[PDB]
Design a protein around this nucleic acid. Structure first.
Ligand SMILES: Cc1cn([C@H]2C[C@H](O)[C@@H](COP(=O)(O)OP(=O)(O)OP(=O)(O)O)O2)c(=O)[nH]c1=O
Ligand SMILES: Cc1cn([C@H]2C[C@H](O)[C@@H](COP(=O)(O)OP(=O)(O)OP(=O)(O)O)O2)c(=O)[nH]c1=O
Ligand SMILES: Cc1cn([C@H]2C[C@H](O)[C@@H](COP(=O)(O)OP(=O)(O)OP(=O)(O)O)O2)c(=O)[nH]c1=O
Ligand SMILES: Cc1cn([C@H]2C[C@H](O)[C@@H](COP(=O)(O)OP(=O)(O)OP(=O)(O)O)O2)c(=O)[nH]c1=O
Ligand SMILES: [Mg+2]
Ligand SMILES: [Mg+2]
Ligand SMILES: [Mg+2]
Ligand SMILES: [Mg+2]
Lengths: 271, 258, 259, 273, 271, 275
DNA sequence: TTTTTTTTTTTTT
């Protein structure tokens, strides 16, 4: 592995020739310009502040609009609970929270409309619901060729200090030499001082839990606030708290949550 | 292993296309589609927490009030004990832990044969060639096996014979596994919650099984018999965890839901 | 068939099932786990020097003066004299080996000797399972009590798997003592700290084989170490385990009696 | 080997040690006098507050203006993310953080005018990205002979226990400074705060806030701690704090530095409290 | 066999029972645990380097004039002449080791051999100069010299658990097997929750290095806790912890040092 | 056997009580409470990190190496032979030689440094040593044994315990610390030890003005048993008023706060200050 | 395979 600084005439050049956008909020698209090859983002909100809404939305948007293979690794739930929350979200309805509508649209041929509008040419990919998880994600990257890989709910993949430190180190070091956006989700701690995360705490960088290797091997911290006690509980207040590429840490904007469609859109709110 | 998005075409329709209730802990019927055939309900706890205190309670109310024929096999003990808790539970008076009422009656034949009068109970005192006759020659429908432990490669070569048999027959084949020798913190017995991790023996005690009940109870608390049920990995309705309160009620002896 | 139709399993149970050995001190043992049973390996385990042999050799006297059974003792922790000399002043309610005058003022010696020893009850002992196997065959023992265990992974369980076989063979009421491990978190046991079943030294099968566990929690450097907590930690045959009672000492005389 | 104190008359005088001075701030160069061969220097701050570009700037300033051969072992970000800061740093711009310019400069080939102004001097050496790291540094410094070596992100190299690993390595790296006589700036991180705000948010960092062990303030020679408040109203005024200087005996504030967005070269600000 | 009855015991009580060695300094001790007894093992607990050989050679001396026993001393913590300087100067009430002026004064006053045979003029004390060899060296004092109270100094090079309770249980069995009142010195462990023992802390029965049975096969536990950085480092706290033979324990006594001589004597101290 | 009595000990005490001395410099009270380093003892040096535990040893090796003629041997393991073979030069001649290059430009040519060499090191008083532990005390025994180094100084015990592959790093300490105290007490050579002070938890750390306690010795716990004198230093980097604590002297009967010193930013000498 | 203490730091509790 002895490489001098003189083997870099045509290897820098071809490395010149851009980040995959962030739908629903262009403020994250402003002060990061997306994500690169080897990047590891971190998405977080509180323990119950909708960390499963916008990540699922972005997995939707990067496969039905942009032609990039979104190979998920969701381990909150099984496969038939995330495929349906892809389809019913995409059709702007509530799929898995109404029993008659799951029976109404199963009757009349619109089912193989709503399967084939999404899952067609191997864009979306799903994972069978932890040191073999890395081997399965590398088999996912090498065999299928997916670009964005999401992992969720870090408590299942795991003194939970050395554990989560070795976990974040192993994924950060996995993202080398491959060119893959390995987005991970992790939880916030129980707030040892202050107002709670169920009450809309101002999420600092001092709230990640298990070890401080989460705010030290990331490449972006995207923090959401689903302030349910606030007068906009249909509003995820989104924030860049860490950037290795720019350094702008602040209110990129807002995104408004919708009930019936399940979506959340860019909003035009100010305080 | 990774399975692609093409494999879920009809299976959401198959996901959008109960049976034996759990008399005792009345939230489990709400959360694991009761009991169909071919299930392996796990009753997981540490030695003393209420393995056979709870698992034999199901066989009375699924042997008599359901009418389905039941094969018990409590190989941690013998037939003389497994043919008494049935009687003392069906007759509400504590048989085994009383002295004078053992010899008061000995109307023993009546409370023997009235609850053994069907072809319900076929009790047992290599092993599966003698166990598996319960379902073919006899008609049993709930089969409950207690002990597994003393009963690299000669360990994980067991559950396939049971699971293919459950596939072929359709029997509620409830087998008890145990907890383990702990390593850090409080042990299980004080009221520790046991998630999917804390199980030795094999991973098939919480993975290859279909639905997993765990019993936990504060032993040196206000009462040692406030058990509480947990689901580890449920496949029928997916949702797992805590249903609700049971209590054993030492006056009578039913782990009844509270 | 290995399965047996339970209706055709009748008379063998009709011929089958047709309190017992009480405990002096801590009347929430016999009221709760119902005395003693043949074939048992009971445990009286607490910390080292909590007064375990202020229980385990009080019971050997109460089971030879009112219960009349044969008691084959085993104290390796001292000699036959040093375990038998306390018994006489224990019977006579006078604290013998803790005041110098009455150690030799009496010598009414054989009055106090024969009235508790002229029965052929006690059989002391100064390998050990051979010399407990003779206590059945050549001596006729009815209660066996032992005191110290830690001298005679598998070297700690292959004594307990021989003692459980000896309780299997003869059905003898047996009491056995082992010791607590050292709590590296928090305090020590000796100021009222509750013990768990992991607190047993040596290895990790001295608690499979035992049929119950009894323990004294004693605030040793406390305001008084004369109010002990009895705790059952395991019971195969009554289920209800935990805080049994609180025993005094009554320092004028010295009786572990419930209060 | 046994020695005494009389057979050194003409080799004590050989020491009778010229430094390698910093850049950007000058009070750092007051109370350190540069850096010497056999001297382990340590830079700490939070994550992202300036532990890689502020060290690579000094790797350039010690590697194109002073002719000292400089080697890197960048383990965070590999060769092809770190050359395009060097190139876009020396030219007083922001290269990778715009596609208005990387698109332009390879059309005509003025990339080949901004490129060979630096690396054709053959003073830079890399290591492409956990104990024979020493043995590869030995040839990077014995045959190639880069006269400063930089180790990036030592908390991969600790990925047994912590106390055993990092001391068993750190002793062999201070004994790599000795017996080979190279300067060595090593990068190592911070443990979490207990109470209050953190070391990226702008906490006043102390000496025993390290992580990996407490044997990082013990086998090391100079502790330099940046304090970059990014939540305060001055988000790009970094502070520099010398926490432990063995060779002189001055501790406290060095000075202040400003970070300029359009250029990338941090400038010495003249902030007053 | 080796089986014994409890009928044939009229002889071997009649030939058994047909206080003793008090402890000088803080005479609540013999008021409470009633002196030493033959065939035991005794632990002096104090802080490390805090006087675990000042309250044991005093109690080697006070059993060598008024008791006349064949008192041994076994020192591994020092040499065979500094242990003898202090015993000469101790009863003579002049702090001797700490002064060289009085070691060049009465070398030629001729009262060297006078204060030698004033209290070594008997054949009372015996000594030794440096564990399985120590098995023979603790028994030859019992057989060859006829020693009565052996004091053994060190435990941590005596350990060169299998070397730690091998000592304590075997040399507890040898005590009751030969009647010699063996007295051994212990080391407290290195605590972590807060203070050290050396600054006024109270000690519990756990605090003994090596393994755990040093509290099992020892028969009494004597305490000293001296507040080094306080009003004085000389007021030790005495606390009795374990007592198989009377039972009563607790806060025992409070001594001073009486700085001219070197003699542990008490005071009626309330606090 | 070796069980020798106490009646037949008339002559061995007689040829003993006729050492005690070898006093410190830098302050007064460090010669009160310990009366210097008694030949035989173990003396232990603790400061924080970068707090002068080879300043107050490089300075006390000279007062024992010139003003008393005692053969002093220095095993400085932090460094090499050259940085410490010259740090005594300006020590003696009252300049800061390595810490300022202008004097290093002055005294090359005219040989003032050569007379500064031949003054101190022209005699035979100082011996030095450079750098597991299976040969450390083996190569330290020849200094007192053959060469007669009457004081030996050991620097940085933490880099003879961090250089071994063992099971634990505690047993490997206290299987060597016994050889250290035995080699000290047996031949009666003073052997001084440098060891460090571990992580604190709340408030000020040791380098910010923490009153260090005896249980804070990093590495093991028999460093407060097999020691005869423990010395601890404190400062707040008044960034030079270093005060001294003596933790435990096994010979005499008083320990505590020893004295105040101040370090000289021109010459190199610890002036005992006032406060 | 598992037992028993004894140092040194990390989250969280
Ligand atoms: C239970 C109790 C005992 N004691 C005293 C009476 C006896 O002197 C002594 C009883 O302890 P023992 O039972 O005699 O101790 P042991 O020989 O069993 O030791 P080990 O546990 O290590 O095997 O304590 C009290 O003073 N108050 C009490 O409440
Ligand atoms: C010092 C400083 C840097 N920056 C920017 C410049 C770079 O784009 C980025 C620095 O990133 P890096 O230097 O690459 O990373 P790091 O060493 O600080 O952190 P880690 O230990 O996790 O590897 O931050 C600011 O915006 N303001 C500042 O004051
Ligand atoms: C106990 C005590 C000791 N001292 C002084 C004078 C004593 O000679 C000295 C104690 O010396 P030692 O008793 O010899 O020390 P130690 O036994 O605690 O340590 P080790 O096991 O390593 O041998 O301390 C007092 O001043 N006041 C006191 O109360
Ligand atoms: C005490 C003190 C030290 N110093 C400086 C000058 C000395 O060269 C320096 C000490 O040099 P060293 O003795 O080599 O450093 P250290 O032993 O204190 O710490 P470590 O070896 O573990 O890294 O401290 C002062 O400037 N003023 C002071 O008051
Ligand atoms: Mg006993
Ligand atoms: Mg970086
Ligand atoms: Mg001593
Ligand atoms: Mg130093």
């Amino acid at each position: 592995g002895v490489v001098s600084a003189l083997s870099l005439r045509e290897r820098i050049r071809e490395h010149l020739s851009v980040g995959l956008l962030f739908s629903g909020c262009t403020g994250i698209n402003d002060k990061t310009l997306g994500a690169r090859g080897g990047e590891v983002i971190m998405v977080t909100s509180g323990s119950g502040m909708g960390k499963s809404t916008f990540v699922r939305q972005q997995a939707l948007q990067w496969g039905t609009a942009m032609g990039k293979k979104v190979g998920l690794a969701m381990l909150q739930e099984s496969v038939e609970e995330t495929a349906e929350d892809l389809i019913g979200l995409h059709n702007r309805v509530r799929l898995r929270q109404s029993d008659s509508l799951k029976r109404e649209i199963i009757e009349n041929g619109k089912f193989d409309q709503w399967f084939d509008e999404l899952f067609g040419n191997d864009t979306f990919h799903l994972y069978d619901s932890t040191d073999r998880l890395l081997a399965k994600l590398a088999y996912m990257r090498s065999g299928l060729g997916c670009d964005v890989i999401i992992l969720d709910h870090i408590s299942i993949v795991v003194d939970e200090r050395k554990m989560i430190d070795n976990l974040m180190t192993k994924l950060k070091g996995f993202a080398k030499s491959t060119g893959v956006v390995l987005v991970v989700i992790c939880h916030l701690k129980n707030p040892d001082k202050g107002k709670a995360h169920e009450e809309g705490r101002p999420v600092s960088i001092t709230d990640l839990r298990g070890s401080g290797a989460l705010r030290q091997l990331s490449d972006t911290i995207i923090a959401l606030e689903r302030n349910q006690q606030g007068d906009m509980p249909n509003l995820v207040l989104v924030r860049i708290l860490k950037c290795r590429f720019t350094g702008d840490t602040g209110i990129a904007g807002y995104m408004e949550y919708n009930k019936e469609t399940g979506w959340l859109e860019p909003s035009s709110y100010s305080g």
